[PDB]
Amino acid sequence: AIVERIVNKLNENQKEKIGVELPSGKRIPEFPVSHLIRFKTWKSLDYVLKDPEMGFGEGYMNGDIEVEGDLEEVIKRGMTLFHYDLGNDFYRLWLDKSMTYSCAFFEDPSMSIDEAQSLKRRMIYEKLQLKEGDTLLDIGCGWGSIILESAELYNVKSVGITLSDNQYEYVKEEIKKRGLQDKVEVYKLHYVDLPKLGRKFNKVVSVGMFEHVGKENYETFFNTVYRVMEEGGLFLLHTIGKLHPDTQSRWIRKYIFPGGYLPSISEIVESFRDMDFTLIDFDNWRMHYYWTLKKWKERFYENLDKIRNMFDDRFIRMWELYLTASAVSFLIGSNYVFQTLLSKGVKDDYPV
Ligand SMILES: CCCCCCCCCCCCCCCC(=O)OC[C@@H](COP(=O)(O)CCN)OC(=O)CCCCCCCCCCCCCCC
Ligand SMILES: Nc1ncnc2c1ncn2[C@@H]1O[C@H](CSCC[C@H](N)C(=O)O)[C@@H](O)[C@H]1O
Numbered sequence: 062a063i064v065e066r067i068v069n070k071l072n073e074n075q076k077e078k079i080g081v082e083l084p085s086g087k088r089i090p091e092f093p094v095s096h097l098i099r100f101k102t103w104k105s106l107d108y109v110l111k112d113p114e115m116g117f118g119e120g121y122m123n124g125d126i127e128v129e130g131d132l133e134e135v136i137k138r139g140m141t142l143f144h145y146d147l148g149n150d151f152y153r154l155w156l157d158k159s160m161t162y163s164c165a166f167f168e169d170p171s172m173s174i175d176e177a178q179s180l181k182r183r184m185i186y187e188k189l190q191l192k193e194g195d196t197l198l199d200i201g202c203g204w205g206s207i208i209l210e211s212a213e214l215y216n217v218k219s220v221g222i223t224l225s226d227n228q229y230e231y232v233k234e235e236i237k238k239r240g241l242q243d244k245v246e247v248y249k250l251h252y253v254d255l256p257k258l259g260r261k262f263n264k265v266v267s268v269g270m271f272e273h274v275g276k277e278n279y280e281t282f283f284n285t286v287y288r289v290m291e292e293g294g295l296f297l298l299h300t301i302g303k304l305h306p307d308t309q310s311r312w313i314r315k316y317i318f319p320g321g322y323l324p325s326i327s328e329i330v331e332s333f334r335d336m337d338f339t340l341i342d343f344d345n346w347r348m349h350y351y352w353t354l355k356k357w358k359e360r361f362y363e364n365l366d367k368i369r370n371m372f373d374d375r376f377i378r379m380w381e382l383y384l385t386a387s388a389v390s391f392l393i394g395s396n397y398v399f400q401t402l403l404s405k406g407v408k409d410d411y412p413v
Contacts, residue, residue: 064089064110068081164353263293276328282332
């Protein structure tokens, strides 16, 4: 009844029809469809009707909702209309070789994730005008690809901070393996404690970390960055964001990223309203994250047998929904990726 209206809305002007199978086994529509959503319990259907995001996410995770066909198409049409220990050995199965956990840059969708992450890093180095003698700080350095490669390519002295023990030990070992002990440092450190390093930097980068800061902490974040920068330095901030302030994902917060906040352009910029930062450039990479998440999901499926041997079926459904729904959010224009290049003080000689 209400179910038939929703199915009708989902199929308006669509070649590939979506259908629903009720717990009784009854189909709506009672004709062949391209994508079938099966509800095993009336409770799971009730949940979706009342709360599509949490109802579908938890119902899919728990196995009450099955999808025959293309999960991305189903998630796209629906979103348009409407504890596990994760070790380095899990991430290595679907991130690229450099273990970069952030948006890549694709000259073309056929580009490999490794090439696209290497290009993304090169574009960041170029934006920062990196040169020998610079001091580079990476706030939220993950598995270290930027602090390691910048030192090897440009002979900068680089420092990364991360909150993850697993990342810290991995980067420590990479520094040793590559003989970079005199050029690269890494610390397990919250950004608020950056002044304790007792150092300033003329180049600062932060990629995929700002989403975890929380809106109530933005002024503290930009004040901290300002205070550890040399006058005339450059700060490249790369974050997922929104075009306008909007609702945050309860499902992502519950299962993937507690305490995350995706800010709008206005929320980012007004965070540093009382500070001597000048805007150099603002870059939008939205569709590149769609392609990044598509490549991650492809590699995830390539290694699905091992991942299942490491985690249960509920985890796999959770992770595949995370990668799929996240990709869709960029595809349909709900989320963006923004790169903001700021100077400390008014810089008038940035190249054209
Ligand atoms: C009869 C009826 C039948 C019809 C059924 C059809 C119904 C079909 C509905 C199914 C949707 C359930 C999935 C709901 C999940 C979800 O919603 O998709 C996650 C997106 C979109 O959510 P939105 O609401 O658009 C933005 C506000 N956060 O959100 C993100 O965060 C994207 C993460 C980005 C990647 C992260 C990588 C690297 C990490 C770096 C930092 C990330 C920080 C993220 C913190 C939040
Ligand atoms: N409050 C905080 N202080 C310092 N680092 C933080 C932080 N909150 C999150 N992070 C770090 O930010 C990183 C997010 S994952 C992004 C990693 C890396 N920049 C890349 O692009 O691949 C992780 O290193 C995480 O530990």
